[PDB]
Fold:
Amino acid sequence: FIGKIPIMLRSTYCLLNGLTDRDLCELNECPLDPGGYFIINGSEKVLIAQEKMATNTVYVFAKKDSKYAYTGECRSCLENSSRPTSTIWVSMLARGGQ
Amino acid sequence: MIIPVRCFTCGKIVGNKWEAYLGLLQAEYTEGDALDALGLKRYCCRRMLLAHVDLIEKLLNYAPL
Amino acid sequence: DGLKYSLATGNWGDQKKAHQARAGVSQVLNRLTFASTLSHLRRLNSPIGRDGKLAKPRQLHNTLWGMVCPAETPEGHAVGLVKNLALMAYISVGSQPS
Amino acid sequence: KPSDLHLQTGYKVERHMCDGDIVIFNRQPTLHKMSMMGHRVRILPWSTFRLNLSVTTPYNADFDGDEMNLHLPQSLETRAEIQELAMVPRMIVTPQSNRPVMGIVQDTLTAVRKFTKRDVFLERGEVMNLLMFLSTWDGKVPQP
Amino acid sequence: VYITNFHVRMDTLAHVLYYPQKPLVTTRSMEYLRFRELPAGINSIVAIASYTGYNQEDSVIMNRSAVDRGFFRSVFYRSYKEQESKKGFDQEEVFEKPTRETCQGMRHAIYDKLDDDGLIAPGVRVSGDDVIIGKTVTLPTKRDCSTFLRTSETGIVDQVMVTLNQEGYKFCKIRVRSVRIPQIGDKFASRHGQKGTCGIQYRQEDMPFTCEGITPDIIINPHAIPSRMTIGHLIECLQGKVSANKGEIGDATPFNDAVNVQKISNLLSDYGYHLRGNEVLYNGFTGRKITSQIFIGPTYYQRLKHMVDDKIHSRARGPIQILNRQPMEGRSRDGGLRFGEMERDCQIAHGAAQFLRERLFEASDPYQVHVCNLCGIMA
Amino acid sequence: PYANQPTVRITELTDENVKFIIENTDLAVANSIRRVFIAEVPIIAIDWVQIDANSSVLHDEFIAHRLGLIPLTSDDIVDKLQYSRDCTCEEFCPECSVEFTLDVRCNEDQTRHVTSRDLISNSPRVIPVTSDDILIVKLRKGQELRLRAYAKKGFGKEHAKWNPTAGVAFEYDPDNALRHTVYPKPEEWPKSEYSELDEDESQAPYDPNGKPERFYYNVESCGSLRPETIVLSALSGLKKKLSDLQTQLSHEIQS
Amino acid sequence: MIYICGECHTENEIKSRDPIRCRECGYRIMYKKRTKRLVVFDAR
Amino acid sequence: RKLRRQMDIIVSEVSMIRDIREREIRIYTDAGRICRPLLIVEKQKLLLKKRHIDQLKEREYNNYSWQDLVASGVVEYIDTLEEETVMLAMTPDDLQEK
Amino acid sequence: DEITPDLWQEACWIVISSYFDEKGLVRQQLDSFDE
Amino acid sequence: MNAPPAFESFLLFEGEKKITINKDTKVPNACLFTINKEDHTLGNIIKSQLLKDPQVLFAGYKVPHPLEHKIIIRVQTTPDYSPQEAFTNAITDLISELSLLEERFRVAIKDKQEG
Amino acid sequence: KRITTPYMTKYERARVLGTRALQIAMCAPVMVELEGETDPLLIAMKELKARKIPIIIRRYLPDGSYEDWGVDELIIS
Amino acid sequence: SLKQRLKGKEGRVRGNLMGKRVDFSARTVITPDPNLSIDQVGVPRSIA
Amino acid sequence: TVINNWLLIEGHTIGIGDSIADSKTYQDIQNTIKKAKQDVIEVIEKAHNNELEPTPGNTLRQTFENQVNRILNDARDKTGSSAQKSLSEYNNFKSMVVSGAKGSKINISQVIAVVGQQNVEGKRIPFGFKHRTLPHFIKDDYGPESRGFVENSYLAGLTPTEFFFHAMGGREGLIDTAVKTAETGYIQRRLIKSMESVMVKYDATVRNSINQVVQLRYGEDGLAGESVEFQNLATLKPSN
RNA sequence: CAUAGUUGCGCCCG
Ligand SMILES: [Mg+2]
Ligand SMILES: [Zn+2]
Ligand SMILES: [Zn+2]
Ligand SMILES: [Zn+2]
Structure:
């Protein structure tokens, strides 16, 4: 034993998985309840999807807050390993310097 | 929930008609003809049986107390 | 406890580094109407971050067609940031490229 | 104990607010003098604040969900100050643009546009019913 | 009805409508939201017309008789909770109805409604100050730490459950039921953003009425529409009229050219009505025909969670703060109102210096100190 | 300087509704009459619901509200019954109220429909009107409902449960001869069932001398009272109101 | 006080000194029995 | 495209974006991408035929589900990145008419 | 053979009904957690 | 919370007069009848009957507030016919009309039931 | 050397009415005739119209000096 | 910190001296009423 | 009070019939839109054949989009004018607009005839995709429909593309209200604290808390803003 | 009459 993982309701390992509406009525569970949330200390907690820039991809932008004409960046990260996502910039300096 | 006793707007009794209205639906009437068969001529009363949702039947699936 | 604490508080990262952690990830599920619950479950959050100060994402971009609700945002200081999925919107669960 | 209820001159009674007491009324955000104005209180038997419709426009108020704040002056000096400075009739003309701040509003404005059309005509019963609501009427029914 | 098993569940806040209805004018997509089986709102005969003047500025006149018939009546459920525990061994709180002399101080609220366990049994009227959980912490006699209700609530204890907590302590949750009837100030909305408050409630005879004896349930202000341009509202009203006469739930899928206002008008005209939905109505007070005719018909309205009892409050010499000597919100909203800097400078613009002094100092936190004239420091 | 000589012609009479016409009368009189129909006709409706026990899926005051809206056959009993606030007793007696009892125990697998049939009065001359039958609630196996209640005199002004009419259709000048209303395009408007115009016509020719008369009525009873009895009770009640007002005015003038 | 088990609906008296548990089911959620005090609702 | 529509090696939600002008073929199999179903068009004609609708009319007691529609190569998932390389008819009844 | 333009109005909603019967409206959370 | 007692829109209070008379100083032979716990049901009909009287120079009524249950009826007359006299005559005429109407209605009920 | 306006300012009217009403509320003697008056504000208004309030306004000029005006010395706005 | 007790818009200055909570103050929802003069406000009985 | 009590006798309402126009009006609107879209196609042809010459101070793209913008603007204005001339004397939209109590002429033209061009940051809808506003259009399409010209009224209902572009415009309006509420009062609270103490002293001079003269007389005349009003000087304009 | 932390994150209303 190493610990306890909260289980999303109606997920493949939730006890309400696969049961018919008669069973859910027997278990005092609404058959129309969509599920997809956890119960933490009796509070129904739902996780919001978080939007972020996609990884491992070349993006050329125009940094106006710098001395660079353009910056090519790429947030590089492995498949489900090394959570630190190493971001690289390859940047063309401004030509206006003189 | 359950059918209202009276039509909210006019007060016509529409509580003794929900079960009969479903019985007529089993007899394969149109919804309009079923309501006309029950004498609901004002569309205030027709609103009830046509738009009512009967959730009490669902709540009678759970166990008592 | 750790997972529980995060799902209790919505603070994500080290518990000790919760001062600098991202917050507002996990939320108490909104149970006032069934449609409200489904809207909360199908909700997406775009953080401000360093990207936010560069380009304004509050506007409804064209690539939001058919993937996210064109008119559903919380009015106030979260217009455009908090969004809700289109009805036939499915998120890729990922797979091995091998 | 009636001695504790007995009164003499110089004593003070914190009486419940009754009709005629002056109250300051405002809505947040406050943007000008007309957003915080004095009114006279009227007891009404339900659970909201009431307004004549015209004073909604200086407050920038509408009855979708707006709630407003009411303060009660506690001294006769403050009450007189609100009476002589902050009452809405004194605040009709705003010095921001030397204009009236409040005017006729939606239903009244359309209804009076209809009313003052050249082809409006009122029989005896209608005019006699209408003149009941004219407070500053001397009681002379005019020559038709 | 937010969920089917709401009766078993005990959430912190819930609202349930007495008589929900699936909308007469629906969309195909609504079949798969399961909104047809868990509706939120009622179809109501709405007449779009100016009247005595209580509907103006996005307000609503309601049929008092309809509300007497259960129109938009709802229940608001609270679920309080409290847990017994043992902190060390110097104390152990315990559920039991306290007594005046067994405890070293209690509030004037009556404790003779609980049982021996100190929990009120379900089915008893409670007030905004009665005691629901008689809990007493032992003094290292004892000190009462019982719980009361919100000051602005008067319901009935619906369901009292007792459990062992995660650690193994007898703890209880208590549902309290309060029946909310629509009243003046309650917020209602269409499915088109026409948010409005209940201006006033008229009985059925005072309301206007058609030749058929039909009164309207709700009377909006027509001036809501031109600036907003919510023409889906009007088309919904027309389509609902057609649906209710025809006996068929009308389809309002947006991008469907099979339905346009022309066909709806032709179908409406087939039932002996004005093809554009207008009708001649009679003044409820005088019985006179109204000079103009009134657009009217069924439309799906929905009562929002906001009520005046939730928002109404007033402060007069209540529980000031322990640090700033200023009002704070305790058991309720009863912490006065922040006299913000905007209001301060507004009063300065008014020139009402005495009232401003009264607000900021003489009626907020008046204090006095003693200062030595020689140095200048408070002594 | 005197009131008209109004005449009545009854076009139709059922146990559900009465349709008739009043002529030689003023608009205000007719409108006040339909106001009295809706609001000021006294009937007997359930009030004071005391619930001994409840195991329904519905909370208690839900059931009390539903029982309040049950109509009761109160044809002639209502005359001899006094208002409870006017009666002198320990708050309830046969001269101000009628007792009702209900006790249903569903220990059966089938759903038990608690209807108006199950309501039991102590006085047989007051019954539920439908006694199809009005559904009150549905009970599961092992679920019961036991309560008693009373029913007392009152009129629709106090609460709509005392409203005896299920809609009072009212009309006058069906051809718009007075032009009290102005159709922007009268061609569009369907004719009334009391209209007498032809098909080419859409309005009667305007009369600058007409007055509202020939008011068409259709009082549809909810079922509590016979509609004939509704109209008779309404006229008697309004007569009583004006006579009492005259008595108070006589006191005021004498003072 | 009397309590009703949340699983098998067993009526049973439980003192306020012991852990709460149904006396032949082992279940650990109770419900207080309805009060026997008189209650009146106006039908309005 | 044939393999994904047949679901032989490539599972659906795997996005294949060809930038013709840049001569790039980006294949994406990671999680987090957002996709939706779309009906496939060929020779200005739908691959959806009346027989599929007939089999879906008796969706019960025949067990022809949406998964068979995807497996038969009639409807396929498309993400925002792929949508740039899609000429998407609004509706078949008018757009692909002659 | 081919869906007629008039019958297409029924056909698309039959397809969408089959889709939601297969999937439901919370496939995101459930599938993500299962993965 | 602040909902009024619903049974108090028709029922009087202690020392509350159902009707009071006040002479109106603006115009001679003009008086205001303030009637408590009454709606338009009496004000409109009494105003209509008063207007039919030829000696009534002016007759009107108003509700000062719909949430309140007062009605103010202003009656002004030629200077030979008191406003109280006009009010009494109007009520007597309405009572006679309602009695006649009830009698004719009962006769019509009997005729329709038999025929 | 009186340079302030003889017209009483609105602020001066407000303050003098409030202060005199507070005085009358403390049973100050009334320097005007009153009939059936209980609200001190109305009594103060009547005394103001009669110009019999026993108060002198001291207007501080910005230099530091001042003028003194009786309420009767000032023209009522 | 001590310095944080004053700075911002919620300290003892800008949060408690340029504005603060005040007694004898109520708030609630507004509704229209044409039968009141502009200088009049209806109030609930409970607040009064 | 008087106008409300009369309005009970009169009554006022808005309905569908107030939004419907005659068939000839719809036909005129359709002719106008056909002609305008043909003109836009002609302008695109001139741009494609490189025979559109830029106006000065404007590049060729700017001149092209200005031509298209003015074409669509005058099309909307003509359609709205024709719709307004069609309004009956009983059309209650015209009642509410003529009174000025609510709405405006542009609202009537939008609901009856044409919603018009939807703009983002004062520009037509940009190519969020590669040279496309949506996946329903060929690349490099500057037509009104592809560039976000809603050509159906609210009564007629918007097509999906038109609906999405209108949603984008509404989103811009909402963000504008958001930043307005953000900057609501910050400027004002700065101004008020800079000028809190500036008052009029009893010498009729305007001074600050420092007692420094800012104006010898308030507003250079010593007159309040409550009594002044507009007049015209008759000895300025006329000839000698 | 008198007694019930902050200090933040989130969220609801205008
Ligand atoms: Mg608002
Ligand atoms: Zn009805
Ligand atoms: Zn009795
Ligand atoms: Zn058990």
